[PDB]
Design an enzyme around this catalytic site. Structure first.
Site, PDB file in Angstrom:
ATOM      1  N   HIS A 136     -23.203  10.592  24.187  1.00 36.97           N
ATOM      2  CA  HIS A 136     -22.277  11.680  24.587  1.00 36.97           C
ATOM      3  C   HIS A 136     -21.039  11.641  23.732  1.00 36.97           C
ATOM      4  CE1 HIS A 136     -21.449   8.329  27.562  1.00 36.97           C
ATOM      5  NE2 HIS A 136     -20.187   8.569  27.224  1.00 36.97           N
ATOM      6  N   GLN A 183     -14.737  12.133  12.409  1.00 37.76           N
ATOM      7  CA  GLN A 183     -15.738  13.128  12.875  1.00 37.76           C
ATOM      8  C   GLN A 183     -16.896  12.473  13.611  1.00 37.76           C
ATOM      9  OE1 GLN A 183     -18.674  13.778   9.281  1.00 37.76           O
ATOM     10  NE2 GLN A 183     -16.652  14.565   8.693  1.00 37.76           N
ATOM     11  N   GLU A 209     -18.856  13.908  28.486  1.00 35.51           N
ATOM     12  CA  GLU A 209     -18.151  13.231  29.578  1.00 35.51           C
ATOM     13  C   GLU A 209     -16.813  13.948  29.766  1.00 35.51           C
ATOM     14  OE1 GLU A 209     -18.287   9.032  29.433  1.00 35.51           O
ATOM     15  OE2 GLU A 209     -16.507   8.792  30.613  1.00 35.51           O
TER      16      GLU A 209
HETATM   17 ZN   LIG Z   1     -20.189  14.765   8.234  1.00 36.06          ZN
HETATM   18 ZN   LIG Z   2     -18.475   7.477  27.977  1.00 33.30          ZN
END
Ligand SMILES: [Zn+2]
Ligand SMILES: [Zn+2]
EC number: 4.4.1.5
Lengths: 176, 176
Positions: free
Chosen positions: B119, B26, B165
């Protein structure tokens, strides 16, 4: 006080076929010192450096780290980049040259004002034995697995202070 | 100014066997308004909501989004959580209850001072056709694929202003 399941699901559209084989390829963090970060992510967390890109005129490097067998890394440079940048779940570390020398400089982990990004998370088969090893390696903890309501779940920090969740998918079911 | 390839590899250890089951599960972003975020990530980006968790005493909800077939989502609650939290490359959106109502509040995207997180990145088959669709859906761009030196590569923003991205693994080789 939050969304009902119905309200959340009502805002969810089925995936358009034009998004087929889109994949969540990377998370990018800026790192003060790539020597410390590469050591932490490989030696402590067991990731593999799969690709390094240097931009001398813009004075930065990119380091791609992933849970990948190092034997699967192509040897041809062209094939290697295409292979690395088509792996799911990579970590991109950005090194702005000079930050490692700058006593004044550090990156923000997003867990104090102003907040946004919170953490990356690693799924492990055994949280308690992973954390025993982390302790023996001198890893800095945010949350030891036995502290607070959420037992069996841990947070550690990397060299820049970015938070890393350490979780066991089965123990997370029970915590509900 | 940066590390040579040999100096980077020198800082990399082989994976300890205790880490061979680990996966990058995650990336967690805080979202002001989960209705806008769920719409954007499902309808624009084609992800699937695989798990929703509500914590009334701590006043937050978690939304797990992933590139997963909705037919693979288990229906048994215990199996569903174990399945969701053992998927590679999920996005965890944290909703702190009330932020959607709070005129004063917004999250920081890490791309202006103070910097850290940069990002997430989506690998797509065709950046130009993905971005044509994004423009037609009203998506805000940071960098259109033809803007700047780096042609064939795009950045869009989500409803909180987080940078995403949009890259094609083959076009990235050529950009070297
Ligand atoms: Zn978490
Ligand atoms: Zn990147």
């Amino acid at each position: 006080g939050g969304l009902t399941d119905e309200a959340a699901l009502s805002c969810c559209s089925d995936a358009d076929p034009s998004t087929k084989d889109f994949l969540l390829q990377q998370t990018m963090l800026r790192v003060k010192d790539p020597k410390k970060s590469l050591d932490f992510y490989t030696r402590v967390l067991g990731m593999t450096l799969i690709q390094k890109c240097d931009f001398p005129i813009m004075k930065f490097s990119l380091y791609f780290l992933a849970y990948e067998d190092k034997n699967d890394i192509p040897k041809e440079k062209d094939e290697k980049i295409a292979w690395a940048l088509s792996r799911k779940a990579t970590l991109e570390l950005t090194h702005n040259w000079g930050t490692e020398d700058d006593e004044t400089q550090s990156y923000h982990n997003g867990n104090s004002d102003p907040r946004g990004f919170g953490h990356i998370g690693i799924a492990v088969p055994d949280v308690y034995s992973a954390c025993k090893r982390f302790e023996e390696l001198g890893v800095k903890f945010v949350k030891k697995p036995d502290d607070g309501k959420m037992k069996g779940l841990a947070f550690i920090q990397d060299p820049d202070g970015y938070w890393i969740e350490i979780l066991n998918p089965n123990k997370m079911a029970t915590l509900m």
